[PDB]
Design a binder for this molecule. Structure first.
Ligand SMILES: Nc1ncnc2c1ncn2[C@H]1CC[C@@H](CNS(=O)(=O)NC(=O)CCCC[C@@H]2SC[C@@H]3NC(=O)N[C@@H]32)C1
Length: 264
């Protein structure tokens, strides 16, 4: 397609020089031409004994991507920022691990927000793992547990056309960013991510506060599709200390640990 001219490759050397060294917590960064799933790859490293804390894996293309709840993730080469990072979590109470996922979405949003000229309506965070812009899914986040680690995965649509991946998707290009630079965006993303991970590890109240400020879900009428197929309709009110969504259902509180949110 014509978007190929807007998709130059990543510069691995430059990313390493920016992100590895004094002042940074990232220990390793690799760019691979392609793989099945960056999340699976880092999980596999950990499963064979690797210390993956602060390890970054970026793929130009991903052929067997994973979404939440056994779903998939679609991509074409060089159209997204596709990455996974390792996070040691055993030092943090297990009940707080759900916030690491929310923190990642916040980091992704903050990394790309200033690139848009004028933010259209419905731009922000949808619980529990969506970055939305103009109602479209700009990025998806997947967290997978492999004690003592969590592997955090990010799929961010940079020039990816919705016709290539999913009808409800959007990208920076489709949001009016004419020539997005994936090298600059990747660096910004990883720096934002480091800060949010540190905040999460230290239970900094600003993490929850900043998330709330960018939430599209809180205050909205929602239908939540639960694991198992059930739907619950209510109004989202808050996120608890476990990262769970708190719903007002006719005056009753229903707290949801996992589900698919539709804003009504
Ligand atoms: N590229 C896409 N953009 C927007 N929506 C998409 C795209 N591809 C598929 N979709 C739809 C089709 C299935 C839906 C999956 N939604 S979900 O259940 O909330 N899961 C997610 O959003 C988590 C996605 C995480 C993908 C990252 S990419 C690198 C890392 N490795 C990996 O295999 N997964 C993560 C979204």
């Amino acid at each position: 397609t014509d978007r190929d001219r807007l998709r130059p490759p990543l510069d691995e050397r430059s990313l390493r020089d920016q992100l590895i060294g004094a002042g940074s917590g990232w220990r390793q960064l690799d760019v691979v031409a392609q793989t099945g799933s960056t999340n699976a790859d880092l999980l596999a490293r950990a499963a064979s004994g690797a210390d993956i804390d602060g390890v970054v894996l970026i793929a130009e293309h991903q052929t067997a991507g994973r979404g939440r709840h056994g779903r998939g993730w679609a991509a074409t080469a060089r159209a997204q920022i596709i990455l996974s990072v390792g996070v040691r979590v055993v030092d943090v109470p297990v009940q707080a691990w759900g916030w690491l996922s929310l923190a990642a979405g916040l980091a992704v949003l903050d990394s790309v927000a200033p690139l848009i000229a004028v933010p259209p309506a419905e731009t922000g965070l949808k619980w529990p793992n969506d970055v939305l812009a103009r109602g479209g899914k700009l990025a998806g986040i997947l967290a997978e547990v492999a004690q003592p680690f969590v592997v955090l995965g990010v799929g961010l649509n940079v020039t990816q056309a919705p016709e290539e991946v999913d009808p409800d998707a959007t990208s920076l290009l489709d949001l009016g960013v004419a020539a997005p630079d994936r090298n600059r965006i990747a660096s910004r993303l990883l720096r934002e991510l480091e800060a949010r991970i540190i905040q999460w590890r230290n239970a900094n109240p600003q993490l929850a506060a900043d998330y709330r400020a960018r939430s599209l879900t809180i205050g909205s009428r929602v239908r939540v599709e639960l694991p198992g197929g059930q739907d619950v309709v209510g109004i989202a009110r808050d996120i608890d200390d476990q990262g769970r969504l708190c719903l007002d259902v006719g005056g009753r509180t229903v707290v949801v640990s996992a589900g698919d949110v539709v804003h009504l």
